[PDB]
Write a protein that binds this ligand. Sequence first.
Ligand SMILES: [Cl-]
Ligand SMILES: [Cl-]
Ligand SMILES: [Cl-]
Ligand SMILES: [Mn+2]
Length: 196
Amino acid sequence: SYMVARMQKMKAGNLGGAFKHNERVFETHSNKDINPSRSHLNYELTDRDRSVSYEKQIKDYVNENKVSNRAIRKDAVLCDEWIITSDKDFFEKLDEEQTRTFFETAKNYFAENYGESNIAYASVHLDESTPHMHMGVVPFENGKLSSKAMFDREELKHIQEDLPRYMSDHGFELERGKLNSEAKHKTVAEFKRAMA
DNA sequence: ACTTTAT
DNA sequence: ATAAAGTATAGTGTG
Ligand SMILES: [Cl-]
Ligand SMILES: [Cl-]
Ligand SMILES: [Cl-]
Ligand SMILES: [Mn+2]
């Protein structure tokens, strides 16, 4: 089984949908693969207030801590949302407790390397095809918000090697992705079209 | 390395 | 006029 770890940049205009979907606020889902009978099985790993939006939480955190007087730019990357997962076979092997420990462990990796107070949310979904986590990492450091500074080319190449290794050291049997892999990312909807 | 942003 | 942070990046799977 491969360790699946990948980030998507979230601007203020993305976080509204990310909040509503991650929290499962609508009863109907366009995703035919969400099982609403299973949604009460999901859980959140941070101690965040569920009544507070991601955009509000993150903006408040950055404004209250940033060293500059200048406003957060309208196009700022407020957080990097990491999907943490593996394949179906990997999770088939694990009980509820081990599965939670798996996501808590991925989360510790990012807390330890990028700052505990930067893990804005850690939403574990068990109501879709495969257990996975949406974890929002605020790229905030030395009083500055900059995804550019935190997750550059060398950093993403480091995580692909070091994250699977850290999971392995903590008891999880999965390997890193292919080094220099030539895969092109497809969206969930695109990937589904690919399969049949 | 080239633009966009908010001073 | 300036400079920080915007643009991708690295990885696999039905997020
Ligand atoms: Cl909160
Ligand atoms: Cl200032
Ligand atoms: Cl999609
Ligand atoms: Mn999900």
